[PDB]
């Protein structure tokens, strides 16, 4: 329907099943609902590991770069997914929470070593 404003957004749409989520990579309007009407479905992302132990991601490269080139904004998880893809550089939130896991796990190692004594 007709909205007062908003922008074009490439984001993750949550469909799927109870305790089995699924995100469809969706280029749509910002002001529409999460599972509402979209412009184009680009890709998919499987949040769960399979029998092969793989999390499976599909991206429609030419259409994604066309939408970004004509001005589609990206959300934080899809920039994270593109940073892991290597079409975009690594997202500094992945960088900083990685170093936060390094600091936390090193502090846990030190706490375990102190609790051993």
């Amino acid at each position: 329907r007709a909205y007062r404003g908003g922008h074009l957004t490439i984001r993750l749409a949550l469909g799927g099943c109870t305790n089995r989520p699924f995100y469809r990579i969706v280029a749509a309007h910002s002001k529409c609902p999460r599972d509402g009407r979209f412009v184009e479905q680009l890709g998919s992302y499987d949040p769960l590991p399979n029998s092969h132990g793989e999390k499976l991601v599909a991206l429609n490269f030419d259409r994604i770069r066309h939408w970004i080139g004509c001005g589609a904004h990206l959300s934080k998880p899809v920039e994270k997914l593109l940073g892991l893809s290597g079409f975009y550089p690594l997202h500094p939130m992945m960088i900083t929470n990685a170093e936060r896991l390094r600091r936390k796990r090193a502090r846990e190692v030190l706490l375990a070593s102190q609790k051993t004594d």
């Binding site: 490269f61 893809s85 290597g86 079409f87 975009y88 550089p89």
Partner: protein, 49 residues
Amino acid sequence: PYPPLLRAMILAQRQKYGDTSTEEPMLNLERARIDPWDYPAKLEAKTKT
């Protein structure tokens, strides 16, 4: 340098069309200059051109 997999498409596309030259493709940043946050935004209405 490019992000690596985009750099892989650049190498693959030039190898597909036969460009033998192995020069590293470079992303140029003269239009990428970003004025930081405490610049005061223009409150005057921009004239459409």
